[PDB]
Structure 1
């Protein structure tokens, strides 16, 4: 009956059924939650992880439309820290380097789904043109 504050962060480029399944998961970890979602900046994402198709603005505007999302932090810090949790009253971090979080009892796992990615769909479109 107590409202539990959950935080998940990510890039959320080209949001697809896989991200939304993950968010729904985070959001339903408990009966009553506030799901806060953090969206990584363009600068840091490109430099530390890989290429990004959509700007911060775009990746964040799409998340506004997902029913599980209660609040958004955009851009979000690239590294989560104890101070960040305190600042936002976050009870758990939902994700799939996490050591410190598990240690603190503040880590809750979520899963991915395969073959649901937007890149996979372009694949499917192209099958319509046999190789010969």
Structure 2
């Protein structure tokens, strides 16, 4: 009955958007274990771009989030089938094609982003009144 959900990401400057996505992942089934994977500094810079917080800082914030049950930090940049077997993962949860193989296998669960809620946008809210 317990379903293992894997949600990976950078989780830089964690904000309400991240938190709601993690809540969604956690609640995909009645009884879950939500494993969160946190990408390495080098790979994030190489493949995505600038990261503000270090891996250690990004991982630390996630320890305080209600929905997070387990953490893999650093996690691999690319999810593989071998990874799913290694950690006994039933579904990968991510915003929604690098995930076509997961959809084909029945192992992809879409989660949604929330706009306008990022730490970034809140400094813009301050500077807009300044």
Q: What SS does structure 1 have at the residue aligned with 2:38?
A: strand
Listed one character per residue, the Cα deviations across residues 25-60 of structure 1 (whole Å, up to 9, x for unaligned) are 000000000000000000000010010000000000
User: Any runs of at least 4 consecutive aligned residues in structure 1 with deviations exceeding 2 A, and if so which?
Assistant: none
Please tell me the root mean square deviation across aligned C-alpha atoms, in Å: 1.3
Matches of 2:87 and 2:40 in 1, distance apart?
Answer: 19
User: Deviation digits for residues 11-34 of structure 1, max 9, x if unmatched?
Assistant: 000000000000000000000000
User: C-alpha separation between the residues in 2 aligned to 1:48 and 1:125?
Assistant: 31
Structure 1 position 85, deviation (Å): 0.3
Mark the runs of 5 or more structure 1 residues left unpaired by the alignment.
none
Q: TM-score of the superposition, structure 2-length normalised?
A: 0.96
User: How many residue pairs were aligned?
Assistant: 128
TM-score (ref. length: structure 1) = 0.95
Unaligned runs of 5+ in 2: none
The structure with more radius of gyration: 1
